[PDB]
Each structure stands twice: as structure tokens, then as C-alpha cells.
């Protein structure tokens with residue numbers, strides 16, 4: 306065991322496990338509605354919105370330093386406000402790139 310290595314371990318997973326986003330061949334550039342995000346709270350994926358980017362955060366759960374219980378609060382909703390309350394400086398754009406499923410379009 307080595308303290309502090311969760312993010313290194315996470316990124317190794319993103320380099321060595323295919324389709325963490327769970328897109329199953331769909332491209333990660335799709336325009337997504339919030340109603341769609343809301344319907345990914347259970348099952349094989351959990352979607353959230355951060356600054357307009359939609360991510361499948363289910364694979365990240367056990368790597369989140371703040372805990373699974375905290376990350377679950379983001380399930381099926383826009384979690385930007387929560388993210389900014391706890392750590393607005395975290396580089397989610399880089400850390401979660403391989404979990405990107407698309408972009409939140411308010412008009413969809």
C-alpha cells in the first residue's frame with residue numbers, strides 16, 4: 306500500500322481498460338440532454354454533468370479521494386455546484402477525459 310496513489314492508479318486504468326466511458330462504439334462528441342443524464346443513475350453507468358461535459362463516473366468511484374458516498378451525490382444530475390464547493394481547482398477535464406460521453410446541450 307502507498308498513500309496518495311489513487312489518481313496514478315486511475316490513469317493507469319484509463320490506459321489499460323477499454324471503453325471506460327461505456328459508449329460501446331458510439332462517439333463521445335454527442336449532444337446530450339439533461340433528461341438523458343437523469344436516466345443514468347443505476348445499472349451499468351452513472352452520468353453527471355461538469356461545466357457542460359457529460360461523464361460516466363461509475364468507473365471512477367473507487368478512485369475518488371473524497372469517497373464513493375460523496376461522488377454518488379453527482380449521479381444523474383449537474384454536479385458543477387457540488388464540484389466547485391469541494392474542489393473547484395481539480396482538473397476533471399484531464400482526469401475524466403476517457404469517461405467523456407458528450408456535451409450537455411440545453412436545447413436537446
Ligand code: HEM
Nearest residue numbers: 362369370371375376378379384387388391392395397400
Ligand atoms: C466528478 C468528478 C470528481 C473528481 C475528478 C474528483 C476528484 C477529487 C480529488 C482529486 C480529490 C483530492 C483533493 C484534491 O486533489 O484537491 C477529491 C477530494 C474530495 N472530493 Fe472529489 N472529485 C469529483 C467530484 C466530487 C463530488 C461531486 C463531490 C461531492 C458531492 C466530491 C467530494 C469530495 C470531497 C469531500 C473531497 C475531500 C474534501 C475536499 O477536497 O473538499 N468530489 N476529489
